[PDB]
Amino acid sequence: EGPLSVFGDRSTGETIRSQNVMAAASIANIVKSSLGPVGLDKMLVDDIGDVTITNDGATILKLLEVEHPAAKVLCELADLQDKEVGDGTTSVVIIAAELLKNADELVKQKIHPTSVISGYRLACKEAVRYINENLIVNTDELGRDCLINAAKTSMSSKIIGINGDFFANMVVDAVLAIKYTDIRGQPRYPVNSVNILKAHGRSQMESMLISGYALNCVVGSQGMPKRIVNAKIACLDFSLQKTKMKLGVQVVITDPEKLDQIRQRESDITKERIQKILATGANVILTTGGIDDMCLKYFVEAGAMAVRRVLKRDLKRIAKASGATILSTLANLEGEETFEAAMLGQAEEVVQERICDDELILIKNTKARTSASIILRGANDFMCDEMERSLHDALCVVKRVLESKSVVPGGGAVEAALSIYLENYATSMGSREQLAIAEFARSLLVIPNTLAVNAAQDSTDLVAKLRAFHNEAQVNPERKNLKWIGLDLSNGKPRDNKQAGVFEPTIVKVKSLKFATEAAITILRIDDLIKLHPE
Amino acid sequence: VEKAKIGLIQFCLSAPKTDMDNQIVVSDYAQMDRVLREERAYILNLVKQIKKTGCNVLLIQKSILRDALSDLALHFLNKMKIMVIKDIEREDIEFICKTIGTKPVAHIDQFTADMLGSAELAEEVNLNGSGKLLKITGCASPGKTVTIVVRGSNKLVIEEAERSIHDALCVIRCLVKKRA
Amino acid sequence: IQDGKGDVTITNDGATILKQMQVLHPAARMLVELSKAQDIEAGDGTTSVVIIAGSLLDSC
Amino acid sequence: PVLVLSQNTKRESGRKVQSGNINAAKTIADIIRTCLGPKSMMKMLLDPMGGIVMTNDGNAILREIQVQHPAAKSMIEISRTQDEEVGDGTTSVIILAGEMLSVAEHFLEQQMHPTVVISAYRKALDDMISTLKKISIPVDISDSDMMLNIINSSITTKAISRWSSLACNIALDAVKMVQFEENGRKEIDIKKYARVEKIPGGIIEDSCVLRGVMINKDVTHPRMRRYIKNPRIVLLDSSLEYKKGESQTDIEITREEDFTRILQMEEEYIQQLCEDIIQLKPDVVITEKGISDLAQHYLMRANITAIRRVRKTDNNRIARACGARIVSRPEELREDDVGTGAGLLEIKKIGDEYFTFITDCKDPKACTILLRGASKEILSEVERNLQDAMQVCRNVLLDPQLVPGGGASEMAVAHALTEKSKAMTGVEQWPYRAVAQALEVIPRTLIQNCGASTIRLLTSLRAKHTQENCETWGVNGETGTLVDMKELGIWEPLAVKLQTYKTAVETAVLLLRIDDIVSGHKK
Numbered sequence A: 001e002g003p004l005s006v007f008g009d010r011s012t013g014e015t016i017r018s019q020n021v022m023a024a025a026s027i028a029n030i031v032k033s034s035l036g037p038v039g040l041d042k043m044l045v046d047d048i049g050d051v052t053i054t055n056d057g058a059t060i061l062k063l064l065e066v067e068h069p070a071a072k073v074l075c076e077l078a079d080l081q082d083k084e085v086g087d088g089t090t091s092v093v094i095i096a097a098e099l100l101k102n103a104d105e106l107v108k109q110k111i112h113p114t115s116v117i118s119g120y121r122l123a124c125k126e127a128v129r130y131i132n133e134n135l136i137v138n139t140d141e142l143g144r145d146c147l148i149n150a151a152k153t154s155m156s157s158k159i160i161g162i163n164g165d166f167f168a169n170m171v172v173d174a175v176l177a178i179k180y181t182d183i184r185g186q187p188r189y190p191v192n193s194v195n196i197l198k199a200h201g202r203s204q205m206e207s208m209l210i211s212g213y214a215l216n217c218v219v220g221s222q223g224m225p226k227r228i229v230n231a232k233i234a235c236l237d238f239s240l241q242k243t244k245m246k247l248g249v250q251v252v253i254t255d256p257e258k259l260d261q262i263r264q265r266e267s268d269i270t271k272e273r274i275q276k277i278l279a280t281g282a283n284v285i286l287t288t289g290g291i292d293d294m295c296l297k298y299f300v301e302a303g304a305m306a307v308r309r310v311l312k313r314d315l316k317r318i319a320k321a322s323g324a325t326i327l328s329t330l331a332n333l334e335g336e337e338t339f340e341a342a343m344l345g346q347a348e349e350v351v352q353e354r355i356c357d358d359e360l361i362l363i364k365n366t367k368a369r370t371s372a373s374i375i376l377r378g379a380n381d382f383m384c385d386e387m388e389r390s391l392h393d394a395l396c397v398v399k400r401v402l403e404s405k406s407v408v409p410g411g412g413a414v415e416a417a418l419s420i421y422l423e424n425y426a427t428s429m430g431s432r433e434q435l436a437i438a439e440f441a442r443s444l445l446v447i448p449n450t451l452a453v454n455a456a457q458d459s460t461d462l463v464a465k466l467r468a469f470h471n472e473a474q475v476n477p478e479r480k481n482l483k484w485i486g487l488d489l490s491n492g493k494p495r496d497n498k499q500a501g502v503f504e505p506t507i508v509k510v511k512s513l514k515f516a517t518e519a520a521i522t523i524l525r526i527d528d529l530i531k532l533h534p535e
Numbered sequence B: 001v002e003k004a005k006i007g008l009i010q011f012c013l014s015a016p017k018t019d020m021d022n023q024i025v026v027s028d029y030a031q032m033d034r035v036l037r038e039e040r041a042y043i044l045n046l047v048k049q050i051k052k053t054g055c056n057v058l059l060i061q062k063s064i065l066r067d068a069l070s071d072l073a074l075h076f077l078n079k080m081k082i083m084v085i086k087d088i089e090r091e092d093i094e095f096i097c098k099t100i101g102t103k104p105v106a107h108i109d110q111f112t113a114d115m116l117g118s119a120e121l122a123e124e125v126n127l128n129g130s131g132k133l134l135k136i137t138g139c140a141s142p143g144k145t146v147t148i149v150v151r152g153s154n155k156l157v158i159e160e161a162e163r164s165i166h167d168a169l170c171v172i173r174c175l176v177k178k179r180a
Numbered sequence C: 001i002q003d004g005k006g007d008v009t010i011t012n013d014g015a016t017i018l019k020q021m022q023v024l025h026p027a028a029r030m031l032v033e034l035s036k037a038q039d040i041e042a043g044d045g046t047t048s049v050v051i052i053a054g055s056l057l058d059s060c
Numbered sequence D: 001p002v003l004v005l006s007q008n009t010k011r012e013s014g015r016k017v018q019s020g021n022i023n024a025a026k027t028i029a030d031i032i033r034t035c036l037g038p039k040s041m042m043k044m045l046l047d048p049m050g051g052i053v054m055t056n057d058g059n060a061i062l063r064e065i066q067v068q069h070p071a072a073k074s075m076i077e078i079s080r081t082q083d084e085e086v087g088d089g090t091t092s093v094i095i096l097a098g099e100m101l102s103v104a105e106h107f108l109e110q111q112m113h114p115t116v117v118i119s120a121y122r123k124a125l126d127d128m129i130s131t132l133k134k135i136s137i138p139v140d141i142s143d144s145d146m147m148l149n150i151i152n153s154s155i156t157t158k159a160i161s162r163w164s165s166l167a168c169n170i171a172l173d174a175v176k177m178v179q180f181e182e183n184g185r186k187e188i189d190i191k192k193y194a195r196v197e198k199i200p201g202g203i204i205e206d207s208c209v210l211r212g213v214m215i216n217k218d219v220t221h222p223r224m225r226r227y228i229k230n231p232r233i234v235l236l237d238s239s240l241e242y243k244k245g246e247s248q249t250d251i252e253i254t255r256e257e258d259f260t261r262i263l264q265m266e267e268e269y270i271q272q273l274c275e276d277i278i279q280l281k282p283d284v285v286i287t288e289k290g291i292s293d294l295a296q297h298y299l300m301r302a303n304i305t306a307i308r309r310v311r312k313t314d315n316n317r318i319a320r321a322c323g324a325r326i327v328s329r330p331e332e333l334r335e336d337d338v339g340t341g342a343g344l345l346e347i348k349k350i351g352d353e354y355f356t357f358i359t360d361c362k363d364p365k366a367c368t369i370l371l372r373g374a375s376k377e378i379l380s381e382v383e384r385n386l387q388d389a390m391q392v393c394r395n396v397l398l399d400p401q402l403v404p405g406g407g408a409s410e411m412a413v414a415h416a417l418t419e420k421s422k423a424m425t426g427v428e429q430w431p432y433r434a435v436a437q438a439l440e441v442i443p444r445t446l447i448q449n450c451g452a453s454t455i456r457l458l459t460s461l462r463a464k465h466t467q468e469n470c471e472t473w474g475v476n477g478e479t480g481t482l483v484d485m486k487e488l489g490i491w492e493p494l495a496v497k498l499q500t501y502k503t504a505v506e507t508a509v510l511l512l513r514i515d516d517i518v519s520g521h522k523k
């Protein structure tokens, strides 16, 4: 080096521009074999022997140890898609890494890097406006046929691909049950409110949808009943143990005769509190804290159930769905402690079922609201953990369609249509931005190339036909229904993706364009690396 | 909450604690029930003074030597339709007082309906999954303060986007000092 | 710039690059404190002041 | 300098992985296939502690093996999924999975995509279930001589078969006692209340099922009685002694009589507790905690017998066999929680060790199984076989359906799919007949293990099923000839067969969807 003693190293020029791209293209090459209905899974083994089988892009990249700074940007990009949308986590990394690769050929020539960035921002802006021309509103088609198809499309390329027509009905019937009512401006459909429980056992066609709530808990003592028909839910948030004095309060005895009465009063305060609860007709007692064994005897002769150490996130949903109120103390607006009867819940069957040795507690037919929970049955622990992750991706797809009433055709019909519109749009610029826009059109065409390659098909004539069909959809207005073909990987011919039933929410493709362009800009503007030596 | 009355507090709402080391001695079974009863009427007394003024949003300052809000005081406060916001730092009290115009209160006898700052809307927003945030807009007595929210996709873009804005503020500062 | 702890920061300000670097020559450690001063009063031109100071010392 | 991208991560991909996963699964089946059928041999293991595990069970062998290959770890786990679901069939599920996974590589080398084989395997699994439910024959629960034949055909393979006339009446008289209905229409058969006690010595013919519970404890005081005719036992949970509290209590004394007055109250506290128990007139007191020496003085005055420090689980089965409930505070003692359902209480010596017997119960809902034998290794294999006999009996009551065994069921479904595949067309036909012809491994291992020509007996059985009514013809596992299962009397519950066919197909489906391994990432 010579001058500039920084106690590190540095790389400048084309050395760092062609190294930030081989690091980005390698990460995209890992997940390039897990795209589309003909993609396979992967296996991940750590140093202790914990096996994870998955194909989604958010979980493979998260578990891998990556330390190249130009590669970690793509890893954090995938984690953004899973939170904002929830689907398309491997489709966005491929576009982002392809955009850099097409931009190197220009920068290695005498094209300034700022001319590429300006052209990229223009192409991303007009590619979103055109998509809104290519929109389909679900309400025109059948409501219950635009959700089964949209949910089943997200189910392909997973372990539950063949069982889509069974799992599609379950997902739709689980989202409509938790439809929250707003101030009548817009329905709200919360997710991660259903409880998904894994339990190995019978086949995956034996999974059941519970019309209520399911708890991963067991009853406290063996003497209590395990089936209550008309149950009165009383949700609590405090421990039913023996009382004791606080840190600042001590007991000093000067007369030996006043000792027995004091010791007796430690076990009497908690006795009165329980009697106040059971007198209103409570049948089931749910506590987030712990219950002493002396306090479990009062529920025995009373014919009541008591479940201890219940999670707070679970108690919130049980209380909301049954009409009960979560109270952290028995006090009221006066100095006394009371317990009215207008703040209990009401179910119609609380039965403790048994599933593969260990047990659980179901709560069925809640009258206040409707709730759902899903119990998954698989072969072993590896198979069930992949059915949960592939079911979460399906729940988020249905929520976006109901919220945003618009879908776009799947199977590569959008990128093939966008690579046509952007090609004739760049012909009206007449500047050095002409080259940048043409590269955006060619970079989008990578989705069909990786679909016809994973299917062991010819990816040259198939994509040649796709561009030929869509070129007739823009010109010749008498033929404008040719923009809904896409690609079929079961036979190898372009079918009608509109009639076949391949659909995708429009917020998936719009967001993936904006995230893939902003990530390509920040990597592209770097002409120097200094790496400091560790201390 | 709409049409809220914000109020800053610097004292705590828990069991009574003095600066001197104190302790309570019990030598009879009848006094055990009084400690719980008289404790419960002390917290309830302070909550009933806040609702008398007509308060909707509460801002508690951070305290480390003693508890600032017990589970009993929160149970009473929810029953009176009041929003409670805890863990406020000691360095940004001035910026809060400069924005909504709120007299700080450090003693219960000084909690009067004039120590309060009005507002139009005070509600929490929910993002796409990146967290929650609090916005109080439409202050009746606005000051000379403003705030900016910076949004980005990566942690690297946010930092560069923040430094770029700070550069556009220093140029406007240069123009007022030397109008040339 | 990548720190030795594993922290990466993509920057363009002249006052930030010179702060993150760890130089050892005493004559160059005075150039960092020069750009700090311009960032305090002016707030802009931190890159220009280093080029000017680095070109005058050369003409000498 | 030394720059990296993935920190020494070992990645493999391509067709090399697929052939590596299949060969790892076939090796697991090669270890176990000699332990199927009545002529099966025995293995011993060597655990890291120093003991010896000698058994025939298919799950007790694979669970002790440490294998580093990820594809082999999935075949170890499905063994215990069958064990915890149905109890029987831990060996047939591993041999079948290997054969269903070996016949797949023939199609993968013919330029066929693995997703095509998946749809053929799942399509054929919906035809295996419909065919098995067609040849199912109902059973009658009230028939007692039929329930002895089902259990006998399940333990005729283990080392208990020498005493099949004895273990049939042990595993039948225990399941019929546990069955119980507390509230509503919930019927449970829980094997937590069937305690099995192993005692080295004696002879295996002394193994019996007592009408109550057996505890390993003794009387606290020697002057207490050891033989009561009709006891009224009361069960406790608290300790009968003076303890401390938790509210930070201290005592300050300044007079001369305040020290001895405090010590006198500890004895009046104990007398108060004891008089709350003698009021109900018990005979025996059972507690899960300690008992003081003074509390024993007040209990020999009323002729009460006490047992100190009984386990929680042993103290739960007593309430299920005598009839009582656990009380903690002796002040809330009533008449409905005094146990009057026993008829004997004696304390014997079995080889220089005292044992507590509570037998002769009116209507017990919990029992104990007393095993005697030669060593601790022999009694361990008896317990594993009995846990197999009760899990078969429990499944019959929950699903009274039977299917022919010995290999008659595998050919019955193999015939049905070969005649259904000739009406289909396309490229899905060839993996449709490999799944049907892979089931012939169950009756092929039954011929090799006894010793016979497996190339003449197999073709004499395939042509035997071509007739319209031959669905029950199987292969005798003792001589080596084709006999009807209507006269031999080999039957198995439907729940066992449905779980063996369903688990094996999904293991084949899961391992046919891998194409790269990423080894090593430190969590």
Ligand SMILES: Nc1ncnc2c1ncn2[C@@H]1O[C@H](COP(=O)(O)OP(=O)(O)O)[C@@H](O)[C@H]1O
Pocket (backbone or CB within 6 Å): A034, A035, A036, A037, A039, A056, A057, A087, A088, A089, A090, A091, A092, A153, A154, A156, A157, A410, A411, A412, A487, A488, A489, A502, A504
């Ligand atoms: N049945 C199908 N036919 C054709 N293409 C499909 C089908 N299902 C999904 N695709 C396409 O596969 C692409 C990738 O989806 P996938 O591989 O499931 O991962 P991700 O959804 O995370 O991108 C999507 O762009 C979608 O258009």
Ligand SMILES: Nc1ncnc2c1ncn2[C@@H]1O[C@H](COP(=O)(O)OP(=O)(O)O)[C@@H](O)[C@H]1O
Pocket (backbone or CB within 6 Å): D035, D036, D037, D038, D058, D088, D089, D090, D091, D092, D093, D153, D156, D157, D158, D405, D406, D407, D442, D446, D475, D476, D477, D478, D490
């Ligand atoms: N006497 C017999 N003759 C022929 N086959 C038998 C006989 N007894 C048991 N079998 C067969 O042995 C198989 C089960 O063998 P085993 O290893 O003991 O249990 P599993 O393999 O089901 O765990 C069953 O398929 C049954 O048909």
Ligand SMILES: [Mg+2]
Pocket (backbone or CB within 6 Å): A087, A088, A154, A393
């Ligand atoms: Mg998807």
Ligand SMILES: [Mg+2]
Pocket (backbone or CB within 6 Å): C044, C045
């Ligand atoms: Mg500038």
Ligand SMILES: [Mg+2]
Pocket (backbone or CB within 6 Å): D088, D089, D154, D157
């Ligand atoms: Mg068996």
